[PDB]
Write a protein that binds this ligand. Structure first.
Ligand SMILES: OC[C@@H]1[C@@H](O)[C@H](O)[C@H]2[C@H](O)[C@@H](O[C@H]3O[C@H](CO)[C@@H](O)[C@H](O)[C@H]3O)CN21
Ligand SMILES: OC[C@@H]1[C@@H](O)[C@H](O)[C@H]2[C@H](O)[C@@H](O[C@H]3O[C@H](CO)[C@@H](O)[C@H](O)[C@H]3O)CN21
Lengths: 500, 504
C-alpha cells in the first residue's frame, strides 16, 4: 500500500511541512510499527502542547541515509570508472521490513544512482546493456529474473520496486531484456520467460476484447476504424507520494479542471518516462495543461510492436508455430497502425496521435526514432527520419529530446542516454550510419567532458554544447559503454573518447 | 501478496469462460480456485488454443464451488438453529483463491453469498447478539478490524473482486454493539481501526477544492463536505461480468469506464440497482451513481463521527472528542441543508449534476432519524411521508418506483425495515414503527409457515416472495437478525413470542 494510504493525513502533513528537502525522502521512510497505530498516536499527540512533528517522525520512522558521498580515485579512464561502479550501484533486498515502501526482490539489482534507490523499469534495459557489455551476465540474469518475478507477483512490472510505483508500469523493455539474455543463453531464455512475456502483454492489452470503437480503457485505445493501440496510464488519480507537494501545487494552479484529471495525467506522464515534456502539454508554460492519457505515444506503440515480434519469436522457439503466427498477425496489425496514425505525412516524421483532435501531431520529439529502433518503419520513412533528425534534433552535445525549451526535464536542451541509444540503433538499423555516428560522437564527447571535470556520470546532459542533478548513473553508464565500443575499432577499443 | 481479482489474474481466459456462460451464475467462475499459478494457466491456455475444449480445460485447471431443517421449529427456533449452518471459518485460503483469509469464524448471508458481507453483517450481528452468541459477534468485529488493518478499509466482502470498494459503513455501529455487552472497552480497543476507516472515507479531503469531488468525498461550492459511494476500478464486475458488459455495450456513446464505475459504485451503496441512481429507472445504462450524494451514506458518516467522538472520550482525549463532535455538527448541517427536500417535506439525495436536492422519496430517507441527526419537526414529517408513500401490507417499500430493479418497489429488504423502525422509534413515532415491524414480520412468518425458509427480500405489495439476475436466495443473514429484533419488539419483554402472532 502506498505511503499516503498507509499513513493518511500524517503523510500529507509531513510532505506539506517540507521537513525534508526531497519529497521522495518521506515516501521512502520505514514505519517502526503499524502505520494504523502511528496514525492513531499522531491524532492524539498532534494537538498536545508543544507537539513537534519532526520529533514525532524521528521516533516513529527510520529514514533513508543522507550524509554519504562516493569518492572515486583520481585519473581513472571513463571505461574503468563505469566498470568498477557496478557493485556500488547494486542492491540486494530479498527481504524488507514490514511496511517499507521498498518491495522485496529475489535477486540483486542495479539501481540508477543518487535518490533513485530502487530498480527502474526502462533504465534497467540500458543498464543491462552495460552489464552484459562488460561481462556481467549473472547480474543481467538476476535482473531479468526480478522483473519476471514482479510480473508473477503484481501482474506487471512497476515503474520501480516501490509501493508508490505499483499503480503504473513504464516504457516496456522486458521482452527486449529477455532477447538480450538470449544472446548469452540461446533460445532457452525465450522459452523460460515466454509465460511472463505473455502475462505482461496481457497487462498492456487488458480489456481489449470488450473495448468498443472510439473508446479507451486503461492502457488501450481503439480508434473509430477498430485500430488497436496503447497509451500510458496509471491506476490512481491522486498526487504522487514521491512528488506530493509539487503535484498538489500543479493541480491547484488550474481550478478550472478536476484535480483528479490532472493527477491522472501527471502520473501517466511518469509512466511514460517523460515526466515532464511539452510533448504532453497543451501549454508548455503550464504543467497543469498536460493531457497525457489523450495522447497515443509513438514510442510506446513501437515498443508494443517489438513485444509482439518477440512473443512470436519465443513462441516459435517453444515449438508453437500456430501461436507464433498469431503474434505475427498482431505485430502486422500494429505496424499498419503505426504507419497510418503515428506518421505525419505532411512533415515527413513519426509523431504521437491526438485523441482529442483525431489527427497525428506535428511536434517532432526523439520518440519519433522508435519505429526505426524496432524495425517497424518503412525504409523510405527511415530515410526521412534521418533528415528530420539532422535538421531538428542533432545538436553539438547529442540528440535533443525535443525542440521546445520549456524548462521541463524531457525537452530541449536536455539529452538523455536512452534516447541517444534508441536513435543511434534505429538509424543504424536502416544504414543511416553517418547520423548514428554523429549522435554517438556528440553525446560521448559531452559525457567525457563532464567526466573529465567532475569525475562523474550524471542522469542527463545539456546538448547545446559539450531535484538536483543525480549521479551514477545507470542508463548513462550502459549507453556510454555501448557507444564507446561503436566509435573505436573492435580490435583497438578505447577507454576514453578520442579528442579528435 | 493478495491476488489480483480473477479477471486480472487470468487475463482473457476469465472473459472467455464468463462469456461462454459455462455456469449459469456469473459468480460461480469468479469463485473458482486455480489449481496452479494463473500466469502458467494462461500460458497453457494460449498454447492449447493453438492446438480444444474450454469446459474441459477449466475442469483440469480450476476447483469450482460446491439443508433439511429439523421437524416443527417455530420461526425463532429455526433462526437460532441456523447460525452454525451459515458460519464459515477461513483462516487460511489456497494460493490464488478469490476468497480472502480472515482470522475468525464468520456468518455469511446464505446461498451464493459464500463470503462475509459488510453491511449485512451488522444486522446479522444484531441477531447473533440477541440470541446470546456474543463470541461470534466479537469474532466478526475482529475480522473487520483485521481487514481495515490489512487493506485500509472494509471491502464489500472478503473476495479479491470486492477489494476495490467498501459498502454502507456499519463498523463503528458494530463496535457500539460490542460495547453494549462489554462497556466502553470495545470503543477504546477499536478506536484506531474506526479512525482508519474514517480516513478511508475521507481520503484526499485536506486538498479537495470547493466544487470538486475525489474518490469518496465531495466538497460543494460553499465548502460543505459530504461523502459518496465509489469503487477504485472501472471495469465489469467479475461476479456480474456478462451483465455489466451488455449494459455498457447498450450505450456505446458513453465511455464504458464511466458506466462500469457507476455500476460498481451502486454495488458499493448496497442498492445494486435502483431508480435512485438512474436518470431513467427503466434503463440501467443511464445510472450515474457517483454524481449522487447519498442521504443514507451521509447519515452513517454522521454516526461514525459521533461514535469516534465517544470513543475518543473513552480513551481520555477530550480535545480529540471535541474535534469529532465539531465534524459531526458540520455533517448534520450539511444533511439538513443539502439532503432535505423542503418542497416535498422529506430527506433525499443531492444531485451534483443539477445541483439540487432530488425529489424521489426512498427508504434511505429514514437514515437521518436512525442516526439521530434529524430535527424533531422533520422526523415527524418523515413519519407521515413513510405512512403515506412507503408503508405496504408486507413491510416498508424500498422506493415507490416499480422499475424491475432489486432496490425498488415492490421489494422490501430487512436492513431498511430495521433502520426505519429504529429511526421512527428514536423520535417517538411508535405507531408507524410498529406498523413496519408487524407488516414485515407477518410477511416473513407467512412464507416461513409454508416454505420453511427466510430469504433475502420480500414482496411488500402482495406479501410473499420473488427483480434481479440471479435466483432468490435463502438463509438469510440480515433477514434472520432483523426478524429476531422485531419479534422481541412486538411482544412483551416478559412474554416473548416464538412466532409472529396472527392477531395484534
Ligand atoms: O532515472 C530514473 C527515472 C527514469 O526512469 C525517468 O524516465 C526519469 C524521470 O525524469 C524521473 O522519474 C522518476 O522520478 C519521479 C520523481 O522525481 C517519479 O515520479 C517517476 O515515477 C520516476 O520514474 C527520474 N527518471
Ligand atoms: O446480501 C448480500 C448482498 C447485500 O450486501 C447487497 O445489498 C445485496 C445486493 O442486491 C447483492 O449484492 C451483492 O451481489 C452482487 C452480485 O450479485 C455484487 O455485485 C455486490 O457487490 C454484492 O454486494 C446481494 N446483496
Amino acid at each position: 500500500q502506498p505511503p499516503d494510504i498507509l499513513l493518511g493525513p500524517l503523510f500529507n502533513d509531513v510532505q506539506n511541512a517540507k521537513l525534508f528537502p526531497d519529497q521522495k525522502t518521506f515516501a521512502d521512510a520505514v514505519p517502526n510499527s503499524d502505520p494504523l497505530m502511528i496514525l492513531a498516536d499522531y491524532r492524539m499527540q498532534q494537538n498536545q502542547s508543544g507537539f513537534d512533528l519532526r520529533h514525532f517522525v524521528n521516533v516513529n520512522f527510520t529514514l533513508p541515509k543522507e550524509g554519504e558521498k562516493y569518492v572515486p580515485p583520481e585519473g581513472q579512464s571513463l571505461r574503468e570508472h563505469i566498470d568498477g561502479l557496478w557493485p556500488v550501484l547494486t542492491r540486494s533486498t530479498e527481504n524488507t521490513e514490514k511496511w517499507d515502501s521498498l518491495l522485496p526482490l529475489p535477486e540483486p539489482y542495479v539501481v540508477p544512482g543518487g535518490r533513485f534507490r530502487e530498480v527502474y523499469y526502462w533504465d534497467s534495459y540500458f543498464t543491462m546493456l552495460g552489464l552484459a557489455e562488460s561481462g556481467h551476465w549473472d547480474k543481467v540474469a538476476d535482473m531479468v529474473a526480478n522483473f519476471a518475478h514482479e510480473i508473477d507477483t503484481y501482474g506487471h512490472i512497476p515503474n520501480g520496486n516501490r509501493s508508490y510505483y505499483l499503480s503504473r508500469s513504464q516504457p516496456p523493455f522486458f521482452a527486449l531484456m529477455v532477447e538480450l539474455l538470449a544472446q548469452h543463453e540461446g533460445d532457452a531464455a525465450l522459452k523460460q520467460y515466454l509465460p511472463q512475456m505473455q502475462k505482461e502483454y496481457a497487462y498492456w492489452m487488458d480489456g481489449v476484447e470488450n473495448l468498443q470503437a472510439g473508446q479507451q480503457e486503461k492502457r488501450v485505445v481503439k480508434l473509430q476504424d477498430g485500430t488497436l493501440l496503447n497509451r500510458y496510464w496509471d491506476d490512481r488519480d491522486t498526487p504522487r507520494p514521491e512528488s506530493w507537494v509539487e503535484d498538489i501545487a500543479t493541480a491547484k494552479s488550474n481550478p478550472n479542471r478536476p484535480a483528479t484529471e490532472i493527477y491522472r495525467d501527471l502520473r501517466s506522464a511518469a509512466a511514460s518516462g517523460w515526466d515532464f515534456s511539452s510533448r504532453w502539454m497543451d501549454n508548455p508554460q503550464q504543467l497543469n495543461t498536460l493531457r497525457t492519457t489523450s495522447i497515443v505515444p509513438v514510442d510506446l506503440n513501437s515498443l508494443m510492436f517489438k513485444m509482439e515480434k518477440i512473443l512470436a519469436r519465443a513462441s516459435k522457439a517453444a515449438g508453437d508455430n500456430a501461436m507464433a503466427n498469431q503474434y505475427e498477425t498482431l505485430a502486422n496489425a500494429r505496424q499498419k497502425g503505426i504507419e497510418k496514425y503515428l506518421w505525419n505525412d505532411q512533415q515527413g516524421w513519426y509523431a504521437d496521435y491526438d485523441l482529442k483532435s483525431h489527427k497525428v501531431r506535428n511536434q517532432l520529439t526523439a520518440a519519433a526514432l522508435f519505429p526505426l529502433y524496432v524495425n517497424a518503419a518503412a525504409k523510405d520513412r527511415a530515410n526521412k527520419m534521418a533528415t528530420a533528425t539532422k535538421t531538428h534534433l542533432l545538436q553539438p552535445g547529442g540528440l535533443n529530446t525535443t525542440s521546445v525549451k520549456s524548462g521541463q526535464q524531457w525537452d530541449a536542451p536536455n539529452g538523455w542516454a536512452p534516447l541517444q541509444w534508441v536513435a543511434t540503433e534505429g538509424l543504424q538499423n536502416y544504414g543511416q550510419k553517418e547520423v548514428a555516428m554523429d549522435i554517438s560522437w556528440h553525446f560521448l564527447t559531452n559525457v567525457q567532458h563532464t567526466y573529465d571535470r567532475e569525475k562523474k556520470l550524471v542522469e542527463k546532459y545539456d546538448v547545446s554544447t559539450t531535484y538536483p542533478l543525480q549521479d551514477g548513473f545507470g542508463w548513462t553508464n550502459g549507453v556510454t559503454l555501448k557507444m564507446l565500443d561503436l566509435i573505436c575499432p573492435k580490435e583497438q577499443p578505447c577507454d576514453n573518447v578520442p579528442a579528435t
